[PDB]
Symmetry: C5
């Protein structure tokens, strides 16, 4: 079969629409998500036109084999989409109405800078390669673009599913290509991070600061070192749920900065002991008393500075 | 092939039934379960009707290819179901009796609020899209809905497998869709959680409270800090078997609250030491003696309050 | 094609046999195992009968497509078996001799009560659904049931592979079904558990009891708490290699009971210190001296009781 | 199609050869490896013979469908090999030269007794089932057996890829079978184990022995218990990279024996303290001084004994 | 179909080109990466030549089935590439222009010596086996070799995608083979390693050195042993993200060397205590004072030596 012939030198417009049925498995480490949707296509093939009076019928169904169907592909999919044709319906003027149900693992990158208080724009790119007979251009039929109400992405809030109506027309391997951008806007559900990582991590830090109200070196060493190990466990736990970024994430920055606080606490604990042993407990007392105010104040200000730079 | 023609303007009723053979792999993190069942369909196609006297046979078998079969799909499946046709049998009046065996990874969400003392309702949604010739409506043949006695879901108790007999009729891509709800009611086997997580977690907490019967700061610091680390391990172990929820789970609440008890224990231990050093052991004694009653009582009451709010 | 016609009202007997080639991947958590075997089938189709004098040949070979082959399925498989036909041979009387080589992930449940000193019976269920023309019944040709000598199931000892010769004939979706039970009896290789989990776990417990020969509270607290943490790690390690059971496993019981020994050791350590501080070292001495005999004796008796209840 | 006819009662010899392109994914836990190779087959079919003068051509190509090809299968593969026919070429005498490119997950067992200083022989078993017309026997065409120079198996050294030229001819499901053994000899690259597991494990043990030069019970308890926990971590890390064996591995034995050294160290530390407290520091001194020589000497001799038994 | 006939004895040149669409999943442990690209092929088949005047058309499209297409395979792929033909276009002279879109898991080895400051050259090997009719040789059409601007490999920087224009012509199973080398040059994004592994690891080491400003054996033992355990966790964490190499990696060397620093710190701590107890605090003071300079200086120089040897 060949593509529909042009009336003049005009390109063939294939109207598109994606309707999400099931949205699932957003892998932060892999920067992928799985989708299960409907793909609707519509174009005019004058060769298929018929008289509704003579033929009796208002629409004619066809099997994919019987007629010409444009080769529509997804750009950012991992492997080729699994698709099954739901319906093909031709109206008297020759307007074809194609529908298929597909599933695909889509590869759209993520920005972890404000993690876990981040929002993402997932992309689904539809493309079409022009044939030698005639050039093919994509379009968005807006009322065939949507999502099911049940659509739930675990640990995320689905904000919107829209399409950038103007296609990106460009050259690809010496032929015209018409690319379309479907955008799924989502925002992370940060709530769980607070009682599971943030608050436990702050509690262990504050426990390390009880060493500023203790003269026992043996006890202080235990307090600051033990809590430092628990902070290492939280750093490891966090960096497992995330990929290796060439930038600093919000949680990454806080976690890093907290190490400096543990390091300075070890210095103070060591200085206090050295001074007490050196028979200078007056000077050691001054340092310990100062640290009680310095550590919380510097921690609070440094966090104001970080939140400011990141948000 | 085309759909059966209507006697009048009535829709075509496709009677359905699902019979579970094997039920397995309930992923709490993914909110999926795997199923292996029979799907039975029945509708009347007058075009297939025959005289049993003239034809000799009481029923005629057909291959899927030969006749019209309604396109029935599952809504909440991950990928398209793996199905194999067992039998297609037509009675003299034209009543088709279709049977297929399928397997699918079903995506039904879970409510972890009462975890691990939770009960779930897993869903299997059957759907059918109306064609241009005539509208298709789903029905439940209750005699063809069931499950095998051997059906076992590891770590869960299977309560019931029933169907909501009235379908959800709605518009989908400008055509009528008839959705059916098959519900598998299950309840978690919480038994293992008691000797593996709950009792070990309470034992380490009670061990931390032996610091209220000790004047040794070095020993208390070791007792409260060491047991706090074991509690961190249990928090990490628990949050691995579960997904990130935008709400507080029952175990999540208990685990969180227990951190506060460790934090207050560190404060008491620090206060006792400061006072003893400051030559005020009488005041330190009062605080330590009070804590012995306060900590268990506040723990017991806070748990009564939590169990009340969650159940 | 249609099934062979009956001489009288007799059912069609399909003789079966399974010969295991490779047996592997027994997942304790999933209660599945993978199998690679031969499935042999034999039935008489008088329609295929031929004169060996006239046809030249003593046997005729056919492609699956050419003749009627009974639809034999496995009940407890995860997804549909991967099968490849090795041979189909028809003798002059019409006796068909079918051979296929298949691979499948079989879902047979396990009893972890005596873990890791448990024995299992894995099941492979063959089934056949009767057609409208005539009823089909399964049989076991014992000469075609076996296993290769090389058959090795990692971490398990293969005892026997036999078949329950009498099929389970029952109604399934309003038609007769003939089910057959192939049983693979295996027993766990418990050896590795002894130097990797059991002996390391006993060593750490006995180390905790060296606190009954020490008056140093600071040292005792370190001894009992540190070893309790190592026991937590062993409990976690063990519960990872196993699924969540609604019953107590043998190792589960020992692991649980050992927590009580750690808890009572903390009590003794605390009592000894309180008494020594309260200027009652005579009473503290009596308790410590008693514990030295009590702890090993109670541990030994409790283990005799457990081994008795479980075996 | 039927197999080639015999001149007399001789069997048909199918000459074989495997040439490895890519060798990868040796799973120690699963005892599997993945292979990507060429399979070459050659046999004489007199029916295909032709006169090169009359036909013009020196060789004739055929599609698998056109001619008879022996059913060659792999015994120890997991699932059926993925194969694609590269070429089929017939010489004037009727000698067929078949070539296919395949990939398979091969299941060959491993001997971890000398781990990580072990060498393995991976097996690829080719088999052929005799037909009723005539018996089929396998052979090795040695210059069609090889491997690519680039062939690399991560963490292993590939020594040789050869075939046991004499096939194993035996009865299988009442027909003759010709099995061939292709052996891939490999040896583990033990280098990484030394700086990552062996030396770190010895360092922590030697650190525990610094307790023989200390009279501080509190410090000794910390030294021996802390290092014992690090040894537990190494035991866990090692047993994860390996399957559960019914025998003792080399590393397994060393790891186990090291626990006894920790146990005896705890005993010595306890005895020293009891004696010092009991006002017998002279006797405690003798034991501590002896342990300084005993522990390293017994460790060194026990290791000589182990290396001897294992190598 | 047969290959194009030669004008004279010349070989057939198949011009190639790979254009990367999506590049993802670089597994360091497995030494694999997944690719999703276009494969373009071009060769002259005089049999397909046509007169553009008589035929009307300037180019003719063909289905893969209709014409002869060279069997091009990838050497270092895991399983056979997933490919879908985009276009086949013939010009009047008979020049065929083939285009297909494929996805494959490519197995290219990696050099971890400078990890995580390493650069890699990933390979994609295209090959072609000569037929009996005529020899086939590969070529690189440089205008049809490229990559998309959006091409992103998570945690890596894509430097270049080029091809070694001269093919490797060699014998394979007694026939000529033409191999082509496509090289994807990438360099690791080491940034994340600094705040997550390197700086945390140095902080814990420096904390261990605060024992040179302390006379408390009990505190020193806690300081050096606790920090040694955190270093063990970092060694384990690092060796999980990497495969077992027969050489020393950069991070591997630093990690190993740091163990020696912990071991010598334990010796110093032990010596200081023994001497103080032996009533030689003057000598213990000299050693402790020296260690304060020795440890940082030796650490800094040893690191200069390592960086020099590795870079
Ligand atoms: C002379 C002391 C020898 C102690 C030997 C202990 C052997 C235990 C063997 C267990 C085998 C399983 C059960 C744990 C006992 C801890 C031993 C404490 C020793 C205290 C010694 C006091 C100095 C007189
Ligand atoms: C505690 C410390 C344990 C050290 C174990 C030493 C290794 C060993 O003794 O290993 C033994 C292997 C043997 O290699 P083979 O070829 O299989 O010898 C087979 C010999 N027959 C056939 C005669 C029986 O020697 C090596 O790889 C030596 C280099 C490794 C040294 C690592 C030191 C750290
Ligand atoms: Cl696609
Ligand atoms: Cl479906
Ligand atoms: Cl609606
Ligand atoms: Cl409608
Ligand atoms: Cl099956
Ligand atoms: Cl095979
Ligand atoms: Cl390929
Ligand atoms: Na088409
Ligand atoms: Na149909
Ligand atoms: Na058949
Ligand atoms: Na054939
Ligand atoms: Na301590
Ligand atoms: Na072709």
């Amino acid at each position: 079969v060949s593509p529909p012939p042009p009336i003049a030198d005009e390109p063939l417009t294939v109207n598109t629409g994606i309707y999400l049925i099931e949205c699932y498995s957003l892998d932060d480490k892999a920067e992928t998500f799985k989708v299960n949707a409907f793909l609707s296509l519509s174009w005019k093939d004058r060769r298929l036109a018929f008289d509704p009076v003579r033929s009796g019928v208002r629409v004619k169904t066809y099997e994919p084999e019987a007629i010409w169907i444009p080769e529509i592909r997804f750009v950012n999919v991992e492997n080729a989409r699994d698709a099954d044709v739901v319906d093909i319906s031709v109206s008297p003027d020759g307007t074809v109405q194609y529908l298929e149900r597909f599933s695909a693992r889509v590869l759209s990158p993520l920005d972890f800078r404000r993690y876990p208080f981040d929002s993402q724009t997932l992309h689904i790119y539809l493309i079409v390669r022009s044939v030698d007979t005639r050039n093919i251009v994509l379009a968005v039929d807006l009322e065939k673009v949507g999502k099911n109400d049940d659509v739930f992405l675990t640990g995320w809030d689905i904000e919107s599913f829209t399409a950038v109506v103007k296609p990106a027309n460009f050259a690809l391997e010496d032929r015209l290509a018409s690319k379309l951008d479907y955008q799924l806007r989502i925002s992370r559900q940060y709530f769980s991070y607070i009682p599971n990582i943030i608050l436990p991590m702050l509690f262990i830090l504050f426990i390390s600061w009880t060493a500023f109200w203790s003269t026992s070196y043996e006890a202080n060493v235990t307090l600051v070192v033990s809590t430092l190990i628990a902070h290492i466990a939280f750093n490891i736990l966090v960096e497992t749920n995330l990929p290796k970024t060439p930038y600093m994430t919000y949680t990454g920055a806080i976690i890093f900065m907290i190490y400096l606080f543990y390091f300075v606490a070890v210095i103070e604990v060591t200085v206090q002991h050295y001074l007490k042993v050196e028979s200078q407990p007056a000077r050691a007392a001054s340092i310990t008393r100062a640290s009680r105010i310095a550590f919380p104040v510097v921690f609070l200000l440094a966090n104001i500075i970080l939140a400011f730079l990141f948000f």
